[PDB]
Write a protein that binds this ligand. Structure first.
Ligand SMILES: N[C@@H](CC(=O)O)C(=O)O
Ligand code: NA
Ligand code: NA
Ligand code: NA
Length: 414
């Protein structure tokens, strides 16, 4: 029944793997068979970790190039300024709210990951001058091949901006050559998102092996911590709607009660599909009967479907704290502010494809000194990606909801 396995829903598939993973570890580990799990069940979980790390490098480079080549055009108009400034402010405030939830609920506190029998000891910090000057790569190819992600981000952003200037050039041969290069890079990004969909089909098997191995060694309190981070994200998402969207709507005069009733179809549709790109046709229909002018929502909505992601920004702030707390490290004031800047940039480049927001988490992990090369970081990294399907549902609703409420405010003031 191979076809039956594929057609079965992914979220219900992961939940089955997690429940049986806990049961197997407890009963088998109680009878003094812990080494059997480590020798046999662990290798099936190591494949999931290695598969996740492969997708990190091609996705970051390709998505940033195409993302930077679309919002670069300065000429937008008068309705193209209010929507842009609103998008940046909402994304920045989402990260701050996520930090508050992480510092309040304190997820991941109690477990000490010691993969390889070595506690995570942070390396000595080089001088700030060296760190800032190391962002510029000496060899753009070398940064991509060696796995350095901070130089990769800088080169991708400038390359995308330069492509935009070429497409507006007067010469016909230069314009044709610039469009071909962008399409080739665009086709690489789209091909990688299909691999992400195929990797998550193996996720229920990978989650089963990971949970079973950790259940027989670090007891049961690990599962309790996973519940705290799941509750922390959804609590923060709820406060995002009531304390930001509802307040702004009431201030400008738009009735929140009428807003939710007229936009319920979009939110539930985005919830089940977990995609903000396939929900766009549904979003276009909803705004029509609301009263928005045809021109207003024909420009902001396509732009906001890939730029305005408040849920992803809140998710990345909470997830980073969970990994650091599990490792036993401490976040300084300067490092926390670095999250507020890196998470906003990472959310802009994130694509609407489901599951693409946990691949950009590596951008903020490296920015705070937690590389994926460290075995301890990688083990904890795959722990939060295992339950990503559960968290992917809620965050997609907030991303779509921000686009609708942003359009209404602009349309109110014309
Ligand atoms: N699924 C989200 C993207 C993400 O989770 O990163 C969306 O469609 O907006
Ligand atoms: Na935003
Ligand atoms: Na969005
Ligand atoms: Na995005």
């Amino acid at each position: 029944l191979y076809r039956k396995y594929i057609e079965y829903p992914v979220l219900q598939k992961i939940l089955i793997g997690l429940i049986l993973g806990a049961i197997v570890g407890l009963i088998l580990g109680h009878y003094g068979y812990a080494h059997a799990v480590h020798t046999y069940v662990k290798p099936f979980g190591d494949l999931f970790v290695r598969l996740l790390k492969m997708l990190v490098m091609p996705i970051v480079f390709a998505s940033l190039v195409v993302g930077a080549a679309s919002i670069s055009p300065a000429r937008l108009g008068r309705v193209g300024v209010k929507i842009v400034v609103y998008y940046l402010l909402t994304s920045a405030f989402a990260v701050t709210l996520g930090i508050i939830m992480a510092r309040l609920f304190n997820p991941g506190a109690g477990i000490h990951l010691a993969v390889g029998g070595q506690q995570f000891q942070p390396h000595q910090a080089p001088p700030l001058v060296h760190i800032l000057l190391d962002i510029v790569p000496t060899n753009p190819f070398g940064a991509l091949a060696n796995g350095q992600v901070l130089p990769t981000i800088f080169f991708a952003i400038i390359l995308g901006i330069a492509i935009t200037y070429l497409m507006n050039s007067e010469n016909e041969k230069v314009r044709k050559s610039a469009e071909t290069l962008l399409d080739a890079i665009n086709g690489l990004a789209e091909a990688m998102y299909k691999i992400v969909n195929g990797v998550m089909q193996y996720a229920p098997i990978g989650v089963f092996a990971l949970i079973a191995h950790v259940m027989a060694h670090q007891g049961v309190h690990v599962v309790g911590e996973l519940a705290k981070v799941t509750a922390a994200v959804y609590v923060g998402l709820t406060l995002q709607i009531l304390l930001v969207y509802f307040v702004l709507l009431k201030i400008y005069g738009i009735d929140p009660i009428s807003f939710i009733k007229h936009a319920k179809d979009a939110m539930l549709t985005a919830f089940v599909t977990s995609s903000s790109s396939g929900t766009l046709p549904v979003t276009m229909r909803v705004a029509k009967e609301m009263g928005i002018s045809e021109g207003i929502y024909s420009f902001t909505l396509p732009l906001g479907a890939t730029i305005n992601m408040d849920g992803t920004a809140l998710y990345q702030g909470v997830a980073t704290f969970f990994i650091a707390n599990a490792l036993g490290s401490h976040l300084t004031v300067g490092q926390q502010l670095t999250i507020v800047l890196t998470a906003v940039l990472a959310s802009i480049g994130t694509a609407g494809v489901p599951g693409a927001g946990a691949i950009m988490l590596a951008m903020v992990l490296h920015s705070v000194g937690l590389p994926l090369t460290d075995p301890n970081v990688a083990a904890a990294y795959a722990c939060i990606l295992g339950i990503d399907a559960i968290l992917d549902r809620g965050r997609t609703m907030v991303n779509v909801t921000g686009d609708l409420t942003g359009t209404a405010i602009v349309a109110k003031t014309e």
